[PDB]
Amino acid sequence: MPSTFFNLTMAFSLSLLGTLMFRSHLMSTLLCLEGMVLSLFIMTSVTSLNSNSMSSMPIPITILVFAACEAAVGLALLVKVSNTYGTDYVQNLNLLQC
Amino acid sequence: AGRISAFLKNAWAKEPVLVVSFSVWGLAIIMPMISPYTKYASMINKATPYNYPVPVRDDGNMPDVPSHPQDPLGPSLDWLKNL
Amino acid sequence: PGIVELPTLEELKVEEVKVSSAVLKAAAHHYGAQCDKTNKEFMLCRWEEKDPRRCLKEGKLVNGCALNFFRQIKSHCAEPFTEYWTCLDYSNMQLFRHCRQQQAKFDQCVLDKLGWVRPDLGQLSKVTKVKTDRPLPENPYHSRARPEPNPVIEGDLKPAKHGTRFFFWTV
Amino acid sequence: AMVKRFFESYHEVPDGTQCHRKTYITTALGGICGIIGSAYSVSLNPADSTLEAVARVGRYTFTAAAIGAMFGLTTCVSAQVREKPDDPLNYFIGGCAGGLTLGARTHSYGTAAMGCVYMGTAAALFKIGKLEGWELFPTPKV
Amino acid sequence: PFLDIQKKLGISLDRHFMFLSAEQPYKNAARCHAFEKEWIECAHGIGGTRAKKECKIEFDDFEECLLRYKTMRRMHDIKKQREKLMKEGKYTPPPHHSGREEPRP
Amino acid sequence: MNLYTVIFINILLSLTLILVAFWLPQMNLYSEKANPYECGFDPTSSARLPFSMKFFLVAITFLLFDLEIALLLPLPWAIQTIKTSTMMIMAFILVTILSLGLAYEWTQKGLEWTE
Amino acid sequence: MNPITLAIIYFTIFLGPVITMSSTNLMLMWVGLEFSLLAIIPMLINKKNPRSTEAATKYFVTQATASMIILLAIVLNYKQLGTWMFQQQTNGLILNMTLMALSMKLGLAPFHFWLPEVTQGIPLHMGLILLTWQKIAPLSILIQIYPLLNSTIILMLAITSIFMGAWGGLNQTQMRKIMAYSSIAHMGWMLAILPYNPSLTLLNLMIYIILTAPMFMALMLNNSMTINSISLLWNKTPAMLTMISLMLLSLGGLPPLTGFLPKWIIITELMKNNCLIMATLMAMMALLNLFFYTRLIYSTSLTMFPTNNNSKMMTHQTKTKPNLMFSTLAIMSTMTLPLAPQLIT
Amino acid sequence: MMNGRPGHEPLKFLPDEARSLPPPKLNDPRLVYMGLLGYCTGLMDNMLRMRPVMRAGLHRQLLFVTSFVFAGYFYLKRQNYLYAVKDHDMFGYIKLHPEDFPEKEKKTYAEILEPFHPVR
Amino acid sequence: MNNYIFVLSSLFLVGCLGLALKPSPIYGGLGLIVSGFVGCLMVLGFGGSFLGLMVFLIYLGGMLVVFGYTTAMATEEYPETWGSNWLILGFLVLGVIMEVFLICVLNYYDEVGVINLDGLGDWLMYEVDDVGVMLEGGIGVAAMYSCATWMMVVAGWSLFAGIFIIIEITRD
Amino acid sequence: IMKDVPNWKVGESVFHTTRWVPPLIGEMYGLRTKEEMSNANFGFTWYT
Ligand SMILES: CCCCCCCCCCCCO[C@@H]1O[C@H](CO)[C@@H](O[C@H]2O[C@H](CO)[C@@H](O)[C@H](O)[C@H]2O)[C@H](O)[C@H]1O
Ligand SMILES: CCCCCCCCCCCCO[C@@H]1O[C@H](CO)[C@@H](O[C@H]2O[C@H](CO)[C@@H](O)[C@H](O)[C@H]2O)[C@H](O)[C@H]1O
Ligand SMILES: CCCCCCCCCCCCO[C@@H]1O[C@H](CO)[C@@H](O[C@H]2O[C@H](CO)[C@@H](O)[C@H](O)[C@H]2O)[C@H](O)[C@H]1O
Ligand SMILES: CCCCCCCCCCCCO[C@@H]1O[C@H](CO)[C@@H](O[C@H]2O[C@H](CO)[C@@H](O)[C@H](O)[C@H]2O)[C@H](O)[C@H]1O
Ligand SMILES: CCCCCCCCCCCCO[C@@H]1O[C@H](CO)[C@@H](O[C@H]2O[C@H](CO)[C@@H](O)[C@H](O)[C@H]2O)[C@H](O)[C@H]1O
Ligand SMILES: CCCCCCCCCCCCO[C@@H]1O[C@H](CO)[C@@H](O[C@H]2O[C@H](CO)[C@@H](O)[C@H](O)[C@H]2O)[C@H](O)[C@H]1O
Ligand SMILES: CCCCCCCCCCCCO[C@@H]1O[C@H](CO)[C@@H](O[C@H]2O[C@H](CO)[C@@H](O)[C@H](O)[C@H]2O)[C@H](O)[C@H]1O
């Protein structure tokens, strides 16, 4: 358990680094936001199982429920960004500086 | 009251999937209300003994708690055998 | 900080009930209705005490009655019993419903030979009351004294002296 | 943690003494501000290259280091030539030397004037703070 | 909460599964139910600031049951001291620790 | 352990057949053989260019309905509760709002593919 | 959007903060933060043009990343203590990561660069919602854990926000940016006093909301986004100049307007705790707000900028705005200082 | 500060014990100023809509004055109770911890030597 | 078998390292499937079952959609792979070096606290009702229908509203 | 094993309370063969 949380927590940090360090595609930054959901879900699942807290096992499911909605809303926005410039490159989303 | 029959016959002819879907959806919400067995669903689940029935200390003021399990007192599952 | 107190290996010695699960399960219903009082006191000890070291005597009387119960079957109904559990052992979930025919023969041996009646459906899961002379523990959690509450303040409300007292506002 | 211990070595001994130890500390302290400044500078207003990026980091950190080294020396030198340790005017002279260094490195007489005054006053108030025990980030009392 | 509506209406939307010792399905206690139930009863009514000092005994025990830092430490030391003895050659485990016990029952 | 063994055995067979397929045949490689296929003529552009998805709205509506499966899959355990009235009422509502959500999308031409 | 969508979307926008505010459990507090994030997105991007799409995208990736960090705190805390609420014994680093994430959600500097741009790409009424109602949920979480917050992180964020909000707003000709930087500066005041007296953070929030609401309503009256657009108010809705000016001075903290009360009481309570240096810089940089608020007042009520010919048609027509709420919020947001003792406590 | 004090009901506007406090006078300087803030609102409303400022819509103006005095009356009653509670808790604390708020004997000026600062 | 869980969490870590370097979303979706599968095996090792298979099921449908969106909106002529660019290839290799270093280092300065390589496996399952019957994670997750019904209201409403939310976002 | 280790109290608890705390699997099979430990961690879950 000790070794697992450290590896899981560092997994969350790597995805937070991935999310905070953009490249071209906006879709790739969306997949890092799913790397974070997966890390958090696995931590919560292991925590609840290790402590035998069955009443907390609903909570990991809601994380998946409220993580899909973001993935859906994120993908819906990615469609509107593509319908404007023909790609999902972030460097195009810069009109608002002025 | 007269036009509805025309509509329902129309939908039933050309859209039976939806007419079947609404009927089954609505029939599933009525059947628990009127069945004379809906009450046993809870009872049977409550009568299934997963945890150990931890005995209680007999102080002396327990005239309706069996001493031995084969006593004539306590919850009985005859209604379930003969269900 | 303390030294956990453990019983010595010779405090934990009893005569074991070294029979397979099918043997127990075949005799489970009669045994529940025969060794009940002894069994029901150990469980009371265990839930009341919340300590396995405090019930190492009631728990050796559990083994005392379980062995007596099997000695009564090894002297009246050995073969009807051996056909039954040997057939209960075959199934991969050891289900009663595949041996209702051998089960009947074993029941019609204990009943006539020993007077034993199989408990009905639902009787073994009842909550019974057990009488014992063991004292009731009063601090089973070994808890300390709960810290005092913050003392309450007595009195009736009066208007705030000179009002809000907020800078230069008078009222 | 050690790195906190090092920056508290600056106030173990009365001002004007252990002069190089203090000059070293404020030189590192200035460098840390220069590095933090560059990090935001390069990230928010990125350069056209990567060597040109690193150059800006070096230019800010040496300038920030230079200000800190001129402050921590001039303060400790003045504080012992005048033999007046517990004195804010020492930190005003050091803070201004820091301000002069900033203008010198920036090719701006105007910055030197602003830097000499603004930083000298900021340095003086830091000294007056330690004498009177003002806390930057106090903890909730009431 | 910031708007104690649940407390006002007397309902419980999410108040009843806040901690380990809460009710579990089929009366299955959680790990460290005893310790937590002690800590929450110790720190009840005295407020957070008093509880941080006056229920330190209950808390440090619950924290030890939940995370077992001292237990792993202690069992690390016993195993590491035995590793050292066995390399030298001053200790051979018992038969019941080397896979040759007489099993119970 | 068995379930790990049986799947490595499956993987090793799939690997083993893969190796035999590549190192057993007699291979004669030249550029015109290894070009991409397009009915006998040269491709006019790479196959990595964008490919418009005319059912994208249904694709993301699959995600929302996919997670609503994750909420109905505990039901086999849930019909074992004493609180049968509650379990059933929550189940009926859940399926009914999935249906109400589906009806809204259907009537909004959401299930129709974009032309 | 059809009435079903509005009912569903506007209910969800309202629902989010109420779930966060009424919830004992942290995961339900997080759930409310998700409802607000998801349901505002369709509102922001309704006009569907290149600028609102960028605005709704920058907002989503910012607020989703901040959500994941908050959730990590809620989960690392459940690992440490087996509970779904922050305790006095919660690890220190768990609390700080919650603070930085929530400030990222509020727009506090240095996590602020998103807010002025998002406010710029969206319509005025959704800027009102975003700069007001959307701040209550993150703030209600923070007020629930104020005994635990590290004050050094809170004061550096507040000092930064007051400075950046002042400097940022000084350079803006777009009204929507002037409102975003106005927001950033005021959040600095709410946050600076949070670990000391959370009640004063609610006073400063409420007074800011009733000042920021009519100000948006005033710009929504003629749909005026620039300083030159708002300069035509003397020839369009001159009846509005009397209350625009006071509200701008009130937003500036000038006495004897209601907006002086929040700054004055926060400074007073900060120095009850010996927070002298921070308090002095905060009040000294709040002066910069008044300068670019004064510049706006110069352009609208205290001078008459050149007007155009087509504005004569505008005068022949009859307006049905503003509503009865604008007048009620304008008076209460400016002429309520004599009721100060009834507002603080 | 006072959020978690004993007996504190949740989301109770005017607890019962507030009824032992004298009510705000109807013509309270604070209530009267509410009446004027209401009247101005009605005037500002007419101004913004281009109507006669004082003649127009007296039903509205009456209801603005009534609304603000009505609400101000009950809001004032709550702040009196909150202020009454503050003193109540403040003084009962002084009583329960006397060793922390010691009475002090202040010397008279006969015994005090204030330094003299000449103004030359 | 004592290193089993440690290896699964180590594989999970890499899958998110590869994911963080962000090659073409075709491969980023491949890392999420393998991390999703690896993570599923961890929840299984710790005694879970329903929670393990669900997160695997849900992420299988998510990457199906994500694949459809990549080929339509996030595809360029020369999709990047982890070996495509020398600089990314450097940080993937270097990233693995660091963990071999961080684990070895942090294991040296505490020996038990964080990483206890000396005692991998000894501390996986703490307690377990050996004579239990009702212990599957499904029973705990199923409590949403009786005890934590509030969880399901917000979850159901989240999904219900989302259909309305996306239909408006994507509307022409 | 730990006769000659300074400041070691054999059998010392790690808890201030004197209530009976059931042992963990690691406390219980920790001085036995790894096969026993692997069995207790994965015996049920890997049987199929
Ligand atoms: C240090 C070993 C530990 C593992 C390290 C990897 C952690 C994960 C980091 C993920 C982010 C990668 O960080 C990366 O930063 C580089 C700049 O360096 C940026 O990348 C950008 O510049 C680089 C350099 O020219 C280009 O190769 C790249 O195509 C472009 O997008 C992106 O913002 C991000 O892709
Ligand atoms: C003990 C007190 C000592 C006081 C002196 C210390 C403070 C010195 C401040 C130097 C300030 C900047 O220093 C001054 O910068 C100018 C910038 O105009 C540069 O000057 C040089 O370049 C500029 C262009 O910018 C030309 O116009 C100028 O003719 C040329 O000399 C030099 O670098 C220096 O002349
Ligand atoms: C009682 C009244 C007292 C009056 C005091 C008069 C003393 C003035 C001494 C100032 C001497 C320093 O002189 C300094 O000259 C530079 C000329 O570049 C001016 O500054 C100007 O040039 C600088 C370059 O250095 C640029 O940043 C900018 O174009 C402008 O600020 C400064 O504003 C002034 O401070
Ligand atoms: C160039 C102009 C700049 C003007 C400022 C001049 C700065 C030069 C002085 C160098 C100061 C070194 O900064 C040093 O920071 C440490 C950080 O703990 C302070 O430390 C102080 O605060 C900490 C709080 O964390 C206390 O716990 C500690 O007991 C106390 O010593 C030192 O008191 C201060 O001396
Ligand atoms: C917004 C979406 C709404 C659309 C969906 C609406 C669904 C509504 C479903 C209502 C059906 C509930 O049906 C209800 O079932 C419960 C239990 O199942 C029955 O209840 C009965 O059985 C239970 C146990 O099963 C007994 O403990 C109880 O005493 C007895 O009344 C009710 O007599 C019946 O009325
Ligand atoms: C704004 C909050 C207050 C309102 C509260 C919510 C209740 C609203 C009740 C009025 C409902 C009217 O909402 C009704 O929505 C439907 C879809 O659902 C719209 O109808 C739409 O779908 C139908 C499907 O057959 C098609 O004709 C077409 O695609 C479109 O018109 C109607 O045009 C509108 O009349
Ligand atoms: C319990 C549930 C709580 C429900 C809360 C409801 C809050 C009130 C929401 C009010 C929303 C109406 O407010 C909004 O008004 C603006 C005008 O300012 C309209 O916005 C308008 O902007 C410009 C000009 O104004 C037009 O070009 C545009 O097409 C139109 O949308 C919106 O179409 C309407 O949505």
Ligand SMILES: CCCCCCCCCCCCO[C@@H]1O[C@H](CO)[C@@H](O[C@H]2O[C@H](CO)[C@@H](O)[C@H](O)[C@H]2O)[C@H](O)[C@H]1O
């Ligand atoms: C995707 C890449 C995945 C690769 C991940 C790495 C796989 C290898 C696991 C390395 C983890 C440590 O692996 C192994 O752990 C054991 C116990 O668990 C350590 O410890 C072992 O030896 C020590 C002495 O050193 C003794 O106490 C005992 O025999 C045992 O504990 C070993 O020294 C180490 O070799």
Ligand SMILES: CCCCCCCCCCCCO[C@@H]1O[C@H](CO)[C@@H](O[C@H]2O[C@H](CO)[C@@H](O)[C@H](O)[C@H]2O)[C@H](O)[C@H]1O
């Ligand atoms: C306006 C937006 C919101 C409207 C929509 C939401 C309406 C609320 C619907 C969800 C209702 C949940 O309803 C709530 O259920 C929980 C458990 O599920 C009950 O709570 C119960 O929990 C467990 C049950 O085992 C007991 O230990 C506990 O003592 C008891 O209170 C509450 O008494 C009931 O109020």
